[PDB]
Amino acid sequence: EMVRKCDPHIGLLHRGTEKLIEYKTYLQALPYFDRLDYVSMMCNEQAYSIAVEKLLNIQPPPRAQWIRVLFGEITRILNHIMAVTTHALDIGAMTPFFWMFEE
Amino acid sequence: LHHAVIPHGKGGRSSVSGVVATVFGATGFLGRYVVNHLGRMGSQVIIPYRCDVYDIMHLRLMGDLGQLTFLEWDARDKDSIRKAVQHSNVVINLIGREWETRNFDFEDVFVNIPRAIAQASKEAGVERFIHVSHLNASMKSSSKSLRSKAVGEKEVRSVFPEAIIIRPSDIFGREDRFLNHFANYRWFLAVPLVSLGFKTVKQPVYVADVSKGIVNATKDPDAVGKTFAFTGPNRYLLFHLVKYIFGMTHRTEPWTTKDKVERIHISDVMPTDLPGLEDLGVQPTPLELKSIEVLRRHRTYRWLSTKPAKTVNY
Amino acid sequence: GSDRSRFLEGKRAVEDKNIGPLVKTIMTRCIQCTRCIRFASEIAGVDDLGTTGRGNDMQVGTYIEKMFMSELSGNVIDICPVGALTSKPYAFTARPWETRKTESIDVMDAVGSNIVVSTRTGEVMRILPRMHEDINEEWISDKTR
Amino acid sequence: VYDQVEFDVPIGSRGDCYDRYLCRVEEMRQSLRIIEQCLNKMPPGEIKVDDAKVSPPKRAEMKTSMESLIHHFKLYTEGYQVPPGATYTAIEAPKGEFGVYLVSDGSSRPYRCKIKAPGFAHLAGLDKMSKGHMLADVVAIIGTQDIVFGEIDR
Amino acid sequence: RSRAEYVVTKLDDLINWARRSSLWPMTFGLACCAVEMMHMAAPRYDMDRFGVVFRASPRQADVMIVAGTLTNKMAPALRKVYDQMPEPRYVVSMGSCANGGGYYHYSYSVVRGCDRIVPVDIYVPGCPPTAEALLYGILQLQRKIKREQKLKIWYRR
Amino acid sequence: ASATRVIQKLRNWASGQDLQAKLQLRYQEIAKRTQPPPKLPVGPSHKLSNNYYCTRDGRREVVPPSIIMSSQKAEKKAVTPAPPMKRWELSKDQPYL
Amino acid sequence: KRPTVRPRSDVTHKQLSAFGEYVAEILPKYVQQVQVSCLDELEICIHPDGVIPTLTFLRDHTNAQFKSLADLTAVDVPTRQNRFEIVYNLLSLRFNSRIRVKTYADELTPIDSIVSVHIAANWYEREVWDMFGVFFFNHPDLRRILTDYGFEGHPFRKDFPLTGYVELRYDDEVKRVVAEPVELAQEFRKFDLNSPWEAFPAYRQPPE
Amino acid sequence: TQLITVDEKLDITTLTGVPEEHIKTRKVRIFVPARNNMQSGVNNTKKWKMEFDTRERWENPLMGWASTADPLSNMVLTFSAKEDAIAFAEKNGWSYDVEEKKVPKPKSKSYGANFSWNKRTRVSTK
Amino acid sequence: PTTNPPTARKFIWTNHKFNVSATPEQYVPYSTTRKKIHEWVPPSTPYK
Amino acid sequence: GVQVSPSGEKITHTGQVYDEKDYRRVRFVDRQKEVNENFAIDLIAQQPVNEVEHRIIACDGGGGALGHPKVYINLDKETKTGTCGYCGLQFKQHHH
Amino acid sequence: TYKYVNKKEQESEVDMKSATDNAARILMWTELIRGLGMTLSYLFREPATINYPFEKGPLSPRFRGEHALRRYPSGEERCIACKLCEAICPAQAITIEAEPRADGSRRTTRYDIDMTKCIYCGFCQEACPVDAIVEGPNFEFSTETHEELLYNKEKLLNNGDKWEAEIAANIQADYLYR
Amino acid sequence: TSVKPIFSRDLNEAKRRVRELYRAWYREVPNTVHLMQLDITVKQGRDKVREMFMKNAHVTDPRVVDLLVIKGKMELQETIKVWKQRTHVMRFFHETETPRPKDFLSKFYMGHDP
Numbered sequence A: 001e002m003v004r005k006c007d008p009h010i011g012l013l014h015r016g017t018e019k020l021i022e023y024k025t026y027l028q029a030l031p032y033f034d035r036l037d038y039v040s041m042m043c044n045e046q047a048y049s050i051a052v053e054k055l056l057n058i059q060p061p062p063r064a065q066w067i068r069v070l071f072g073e074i075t076r077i078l079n080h081i082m083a084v085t086t087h088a089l090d091i092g093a094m095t096p097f098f099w100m101f102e103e
Numbered sequence B: 001l002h003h004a005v006i007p008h009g010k011g012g013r014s015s016v017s018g019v020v021a022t023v024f025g026a027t028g029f030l031g032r033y034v035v036n037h038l039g040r041m042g043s044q045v046i047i048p049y050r051c052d053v054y055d056i057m058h059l060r061l062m063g064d065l066g067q068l069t070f071l072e073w074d075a076r077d078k079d080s081i082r083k084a085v086q087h088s089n090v091v092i093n094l095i096g097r098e099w100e101t102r103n104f105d106f107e108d109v110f111v112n113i114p115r116a117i118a119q120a121s122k123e124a125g126v127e128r129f130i131h132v133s134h135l136n137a138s139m140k141s142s143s144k145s146l147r148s149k150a151v152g153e154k155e156v157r158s159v160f161p162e163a164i165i166i167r168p169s170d171i172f173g174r175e176d177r178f179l180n181h182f183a184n185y186r187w188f189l190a191v192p193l194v195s196l197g198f199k200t201v202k203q204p205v206y207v208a209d210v211s212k213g214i215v216n217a218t219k220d221p222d223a224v225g226k227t228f229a230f231t232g233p234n235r236y237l238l239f240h241l242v243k244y245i246f247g248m249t250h251r252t253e254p255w256t257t258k259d260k261v262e263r264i265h266i267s268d269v270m271p272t273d274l275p276g277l278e279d280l281g282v283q284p285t286p287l288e289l290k291s292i293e294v295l296r297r298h299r300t301y302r303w304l305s306t307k308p309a310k311t312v313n314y
Numbered sequence C: 001g002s003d004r005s006r007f008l009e010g011k012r013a014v015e016d017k018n019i020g021p022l023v024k025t026i027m028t029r030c031i032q033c034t035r036c037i038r039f040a041s042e043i044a045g046v047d048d049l050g051t052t053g054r055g056n057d058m059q060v061g062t063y064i065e066k067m068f069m070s071e072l073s074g075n076v077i078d079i080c081p082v083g084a085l086t087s088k089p090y091a092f093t094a095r096p097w098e099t100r101k102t103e104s105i106d107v108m109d110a111v112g113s114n115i116v117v118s119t120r121t122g123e124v125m126r127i128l129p130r131m132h133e134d135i136n137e138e139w140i141s142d143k144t145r
Numbered sequence D: 001v002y003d004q005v006e007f008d009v010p011i012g013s014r015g016d017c018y019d020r021y022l023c024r025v026e027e028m029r030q031s032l033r034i035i036e037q038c039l040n041k042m043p044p045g046e047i048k049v050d051d052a053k054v055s056p057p058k059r060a061e062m063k064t065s066m067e068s069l070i071h072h073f074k075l076y077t078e079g080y081q082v083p084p085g086a087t088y089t090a091i092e093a094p095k096g097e098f099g100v101y102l103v104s105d106g107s108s109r110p111y112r113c114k115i116k117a118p119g120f121a122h123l124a125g126l127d128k129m130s131k132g133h134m135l136a137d138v139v140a141i142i143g144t145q146d147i148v149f150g151e152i153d154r
Numbered sequence E: 001r002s003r004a005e006y007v008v009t010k011l012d013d014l015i016n017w018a019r020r021s022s023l024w025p026m027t028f029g030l031a032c033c034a035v036e037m038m039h040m041a042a043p044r045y046d047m048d049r050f051g052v053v054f055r056a057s058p059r060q061a062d063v064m065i066v067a068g069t070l071t072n073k074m075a076p077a078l079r080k081v082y083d084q085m086p087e088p089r090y091v092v093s094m095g096s097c098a099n100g101g102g103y104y105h106y107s108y109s110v111v112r113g114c115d116r117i118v119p120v121d122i123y124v125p126g127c128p129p130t131a132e133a134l135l136y137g138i139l140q141l142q143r144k145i146k147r148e149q150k151l152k153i154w155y156r157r
Numbered sequence F: 001a002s003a004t005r006v007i008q009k010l011r012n013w014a015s016g017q018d019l020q021a022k023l024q025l026r027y028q029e030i031a032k033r034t035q036p037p038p039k040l041p042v043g044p045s046h047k048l049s050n051n052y053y054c055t056r057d058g059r060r061e062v063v064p065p066s067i068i069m070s071s072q073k074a075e076k077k078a079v080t081p082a083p084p085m086k087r088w089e090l091s092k093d094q095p096y097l
Numbered sequence G: 001k002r003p004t005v006r007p008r009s010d011v012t013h014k015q016l017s018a019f020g021e022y023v024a025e026i027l028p029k030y031v032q033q034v035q036v037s038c039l040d041e042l043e044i045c046i047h048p049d050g051v052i053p054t055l056t057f058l059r060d061h062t063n064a065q066f067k068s069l070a071d072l073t074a075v076d077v078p079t080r081q082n083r084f085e086i087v088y089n090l091l092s093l094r095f096n097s098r099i100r101v102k103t104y105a106d107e108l109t110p111i112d113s114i115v116s117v118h119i120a121a122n123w124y125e126r127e128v129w130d131m132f133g134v135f136f137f138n139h140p141d142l143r144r145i146l147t148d149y150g151f152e153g154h155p156f157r158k159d160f161p162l163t164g165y166v167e168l169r170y171d172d173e174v175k176r177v178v179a180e181p182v183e184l185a186q187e188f189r190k191f192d193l194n195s196p197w198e199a200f201p202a203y204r205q206p207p208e
Numbered sequence H: 001t002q003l004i005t006v007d008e009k010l011d012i013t014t015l016t017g018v019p020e021e022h023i024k025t026r027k028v029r030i031f032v033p034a035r036n037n038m039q040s041g042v043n044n045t046k047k048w049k050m051e052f053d054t055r056e057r058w059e060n061p062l063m064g065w066a067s068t069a070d071p072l073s074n075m076v077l078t079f080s081a082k083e084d085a086i087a088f089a090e091k092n093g094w095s096y097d098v099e100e101k102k103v104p105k106p107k108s109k110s111y112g113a114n115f116s117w118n119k120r121t122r123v124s125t126k
Numbered sequence I: 001p002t003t004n005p006p007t008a009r010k011f012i013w014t015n016h017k018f019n020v021s022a023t024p025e026q027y028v029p030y031s032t033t034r035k036k037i038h039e040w041v042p043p044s045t046p047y048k
Numbered sequence J: 001g002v003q004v005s006p007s008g009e010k011i012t013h014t015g016q017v018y019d020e021k022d023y024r025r026v027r028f029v030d031r032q033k034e035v036n037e038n039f040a041i042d043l044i045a046q047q048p049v050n051e052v053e054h055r056i057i058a059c060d061g062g063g064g065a066l067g068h069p070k071v072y073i074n075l076d077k078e079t080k081t082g083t084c085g086y087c088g089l090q091f092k093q094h095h096h
Numbered sequence K: 001t002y003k004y005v006n007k008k009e010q011e012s013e014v015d016m017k018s019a020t021d022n023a024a025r026i027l028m029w030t031e032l033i034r035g036l037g038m039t040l041s042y043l044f045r046e047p048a049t050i051n052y053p054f055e056k057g058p059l060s061p062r063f064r065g066e067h068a069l070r071r072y073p074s075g076e077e078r079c080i081a082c083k084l085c086e087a088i089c090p091a092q093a094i095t096i097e098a099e100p101r102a103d104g105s106r107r108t109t110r111y112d113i114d115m116t117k118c119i120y121c122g123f124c125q126e127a128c129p130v131d132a133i134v135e136g137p138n139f140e141f142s143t144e145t146h147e148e149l150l151y152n153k154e155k156l157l158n159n160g161d162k163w164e165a166e167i168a169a170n171i172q173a174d175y176l177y178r
Numbered sequence L: 001t002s003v004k005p006i007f008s009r010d011l012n013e014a015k016r017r018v019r020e021l022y023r024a025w026y027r028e029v030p031n032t033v034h035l036m037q038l039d040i041t042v043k044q045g046r047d048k049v050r051e052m053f054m055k056n057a058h059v060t061d062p063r064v065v066d067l068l069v070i071k072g073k074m075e076l077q078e079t080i081k082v083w084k085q086r087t088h089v090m091r092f093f094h095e096t097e098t099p100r101p102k103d104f105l106s107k108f109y110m111g112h113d114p
């Protein structure tokens, strides 16, 4: 019953995202981050936007910043629901999975 | 030639080989390997079918997008045959049964359907027609199916004088009715061999070899109006073949019919005057090399993880 | 330049010309830089193009209905910075970002002008000159183009 | 405006799956608190940066003005040019720290884009966390590590 | 027509009704599209109400929902799992990745569509297509396997 | 919202929470699907004067990084990359769960 | 003041310049360059021989305490002799700072792995080897982590094609998933999205 | 003790992983790209480029798209120097054709030449 | 669309069609461009 | 309008039709080749010429922001109506 | 600031009543009974299941569904073959070929969008300067073959003519935001 | 013309590492064929290994030989613990690919590829 060694083999979802991004433009490479973490879409968008905005030495308007923070926290709620409910589903409980997926 | 039939590319999946082939028996055992080779080099394969779309569904992965055209047809619908062969330069005929139904019999399947297909192909003006008969189906054979295939050969040569006729031997493969048949004799008490199988001599031929020969006959300018004999490199007795298959398995739609056992006990003729796989550019791989992938599914767990049968000249 | 406009008035519009089947003229886009006029005066040597009028109404072209066809007449399509003088065979065909550029040599005459073949999706779409100071400078003949 | 909003940070004390689950739930609650603050303090104003060389203009401005049409054309064909340089921008992702290392060569395409995943390091550390444990235990460790594989593999 | 063909047609109706009323999938789920799959499993759309059972083993599966990006490292696993599934099996590809490669079509390690590996019955377009649209694809699959006439083909053999 | 009082009391007692006050099914309190047309405001650069782009070109103010020391070009107290981080204060709202 | 321009604080620039001088004078044996960007990010470029001492000093120093490795990556610039630029981003939680350490390598000179210093460097250096072919000395288990099994070539290199060299498909004749030389139904259309006019005069290189 | 001698040409073709067809049969071009004469800017004529020889692009039977069979069709590499491109090409084992940087010749531009007393440079219009 | 009907246009379909997949009236793709390279036509009369 | 070839196949508005001996019409065997019935060239030919009173007219295609970018057409040629490059509407100056 | 999720203040001692409470909790399954009770409460709520296909999930006019090519009210195609949609298309799913029409208009001869390559991101409909290409609200267009998702200009124009009564209304509802 | 060695000072112990790697591959080929149920025989698998080695045999740079040995050890270890599957092993033989003959007449008859 012991776990003596654990070796996770990955790359089963390797997509060459960085090579495609460096072969595309910045706006064209923006929706790649939506599919990098397909639960934290606005958060990846926000991180990429902050990186490009830093490199461009520009800042978004305050309303855009407030909207980005609001949907970042909505996305945090989405992702924490995803994590907690899938953890409970793997342990064996699925009614919170259904409830929080209605949410 | 037309501008859309000029070959292009390196012969891959997305290339164009310039082959527009209507394959009639594509839903069978040899037909899947033929369609696999055609779509592998990249060709416009028209599949007329009469069974279910679920039954033909395994053919869909087997070519590029739009390179395979599936269409329903009926053997009594010469209009459907004409609509299948209307836009093609090669028509390949693989229609056959090992038994007789109440709707189609041996004479109909081996004569009337190939004659109608070749007549429609001649009316549509296709450049090449290939018809697959069977070896030692010469004439006046003991079984009805071989005589029917002989009459069908005569009718196909009458209506389409330059038809390439290919006579392979008993074809073995993963989904064949030869090696799986001999493996399924073990489910009974013993092995029912007539004269203990000593009088019958057979040289089985691999299904991939037959399909490569068919494709090279489509692409070969010298194969027009010829009859080929597609046979394996080694001749085995029936008893030695049964010994080899049972020792390779390590153990120790009707299942069988009178025509089937008659064709089993009919010996294979010597191919002397006919050209063959080496003349169409295919090296005949042996059953010893290509037998493990077939008989592995009949083994047990202890035997999941054998001397060849000896070869005669006659 | 700036990233926005303060022009709240109505823009002017100029009727087009028909100087030939090679150069399509949409003269509303013209910014009156006299590059075509100077090229036709100095290199083509025809003295056919010019400015008629005064002020904002000053129009580049020919005053009469005259067909401007000499050799070396696609170079006005080259040197027009705006899309006022475009190529009529190349009209509405491709885009510069999608066209691939292949540096080759012209064989229409024995000058051997260095050219770029602009090919999109495996089809030859355009012919442009290459800068070679010892052969053809910046220009190619009309037959070449 | 995370410096402008106020919230609490859930801190565990035992370092196990239970503490991580409690931290994630209290992060949900603090996220709801920040959502309340954002709803109450949403300001008026424009929606993109007022710079048509980076953000595209409005469609009416694009269909009316020459500069707006030109900038819309260039932004939606070539895109804005980013000045050359390298940055590493890391934000607090829900799954951890999301990092982007951008190297720009001065053109309208990024020269290099390395994506740093928290799940990559977490699943690298899966073997340490699974010492002296069970099958259901390593399943629970995978569940509490918040592992997604698109971000891990890229 | 003959009375026997009417009985054969009614038997086809019964068998097709059983197969479309009891449609147990395993979702070979990879990505974004698998997340949207479990949003279709979610209480709003209720494929369990439709008769479609969530989280079935490949040994008990009828249709494979290819949900996500099929990579070169994953394609042999996809083919092996498809081969382990019993013979009355269908394939619903979902999303642009499983359809034709999608946003990673020109990638070195992405199979350009799962139809290069397994025979796809129905393609569901989107990135991700909504759970509403995936349930549309499932009902289209039920109609398609309602259209099957296997005993009719066997009788006309 | 259509539940009877008996079922509502049973649900409230069985869950321990007031459920009818916070229903997870939206009935009428949500916004209308048809909205009046908006009028979005304009940004700070929407002015007809004193709006030269060189005075607000943040993209062109990026400079190459300053070389502190180079191997080809180039008693004091020890320093840190930043002052040490201030300890976080405990929450005055709810410090413990 | 300007709503479209990112605000600039010079205290971070001064602090990072002071710390760059600090690290440069502490380790003159390995540190080749120190720069602070306009984004207030400190980059220290070192010799490949000093990767272990530099990382150990940054992790274990009292003033540094860069105990968290943000990431480990490589950049392929195939115009210089040592074409792979290995970049270590590190985070100091004690001082709330971030640092970047750069070094160089080519296809035939491996650099020392820092698994003994940071444990995430195991998988990160596995990724760097799999994507670029930069070997790492004294690694516990250096092998592929993202590519296909038996994948030939390192795909994140600049000279590696975007679509690759082989593609997988199911062959029914062999009943397998087989690799073919790659053929595209539609070729990837490259776009020349570069303006012929110079954008940033601050980065104008001198003529050759 | 930790420094050896190697007297070869730095061949890494066995480690690049490229198939031997796309090493031996390919030709590469090293060149400064010509200025697009439809514009006047010269920012695209600063960096050396290596490209590959054009291979076959045929027509898809289904959609008419441009289908290709070689992977090195969109491969363009940027270099700061001709010698750097030479080193990269010889290191990767590709046979190269190099053409030197075509620089524009300096020209004597005089605005007063347009209004000459006796020379032919006097213009007839403006 | 009874109190607020849509704007009437002459090119709008007067008969809605459902999903016609796996029907004779399904959609079949083709290249909408004409022939690009024109082959030389040999003369129909012999030289001798 | 939609016309048919001697092969019986409908000709698209781009002028595309398959040849008699072209094999690529087997994709239309047992199916249909759909051609959009409304031809834009015919529909814009049916439009009457707008008779305006100005030497320079402005067109946005109607609807303001719902149309095309606003352009100006110079109606100086009295032997030819001025055509919008976006919407194809024709304008004529009223000189009476 | 920060807060503790599992730390508890000081000690609550070890009292006989507290020990009896814990023993009763882990001998009579009190938390198990209360979990059963609130799962019973959800048994007695109303399900959140809509009646597909007779009931549809709510959407917005911004919804990015099936692609379509629109027209002017005159009937002329809105598309002017300007190729920005395929220039901005991040998946390179749009292929455009163009030539002057018989009346000299700038129109496309080929406008193909691959649904199997498209990522449904709306970049084409937000880069289109004349509102020609749109992502209309159709999403129930799943096909049984891979070919049927390879759209061409005729299919896109047919979709635009079919969905014009809804696409134009959605653009009217939302165009002031964009 | 002086560089830093990776593992081997010169070609001698590099060839020793090559011999050790070839020895271990020759050991593992029958176990590979038996365990992963390969259609091939033991003889032609060893021939495949040998002609892979002869394909790489033309290089004499010690660093390149060391890196080739390292990559061969990775491939071998990947075969030892079975992650590389039957399809990945059978990718070495190209039995589903029609080969291109190298004669000028055949390359002329196929297409424009040199």
Ligand SMILES: NC(=O)C1=CN([C@@H]2O[C@H](COP(=O)(O)OP(=O)(O)OC[C@H]3O[C@@H](n4cnc5c(N)ncnc54)[C@H](OP(=O)(O)O)[C@@H]3O)[C@@H](O)[C@H]2O)C=CC1
Pocket: B024, B025, B026, B027, B028, B029, B030, B031, B049, B050, B051, B075, B093, B094, B095, B096, B097, B098, B104, B109, B113, B132, B133, B134, B135, B168, B169, B170, B171, B172, B176, B177, B178
């Ligand atoms: N199989 C062998 O070992 C050998 C075979 N041959 C010959 O090669 C050919 C192909 O062999 P094989 O694949 O094994 O044969 P099959 O038994 O598999 O049948 C071949 C094809 O014929 C079709 N067919 C059968 N009867 C009819 C009919 N009445 N009308 C229309 N189509 C029909 C079947 O379609 P459906 O699924 O709809 O029934 C099937 O696709 C045959 O002509 C056979 O005689 C020769 C030597 C050896």
Ligand code: SF4
Pocket: C029, C030, C031, C032, C033, C034, C035, C036, C037, C060, C079, C080, C081, C082, C084, C085
């Ligand atoms: S070159 Fe072009 S822009 Fe310049 S004056 Fe001539 S037409 Fe006008």
Ligand code: SF4
Pocket: C029, C081, C082, C083, C084, D070
């Ligand atoms: S592309 Fe240039 S020339 Fe053409 S309309 Fe725009 S600004 Fe004028």
Ligand code: SF4
Pocket: A035, A038, E031, E032, E033, E067, E068, E069, E094, E095, E096, E097, E098, E102, E103, E126, E127, E128, E129, K119
């Ligand atoms: S099709 Fe789109 S949503 Fe689905 S897996 Fe691919 S990237 Fe994700």
Ligand code: SF4
Pocket: K085, K088, K089, K090, K091, K092, K093, K094, K113, K117, K118, K119, K120, K121, K122, K123, K124, K125, K135
């Ligand atoms: S929505 Fe689809 S077609 Fe449009 S730009 Fe995005 S990926 Fe391309």
Ligand code: SF4
Pocket: K078, K079, K080, K081, K082, K083, K084, K085, K086, K096, K124, K127, K128, K129, K130, K131, K132, K133
């Ligand atoms: S952006 Fe619009 S008008 Fe331009 S080519 Fe695309 S669909 Fe046509």
Ligand SMILES: [K+]
Pocket: C076, C077, C078, C079, C080, C081, C082, C083, C084, C085, C086
């Ligand atoms: K011009």
Ligand SMILES: [Zn+2]
Pocket: J059, J060, J061, J068, J084, J085, J086, J087, J088, J089
């Ligand atoms: Zn207009």
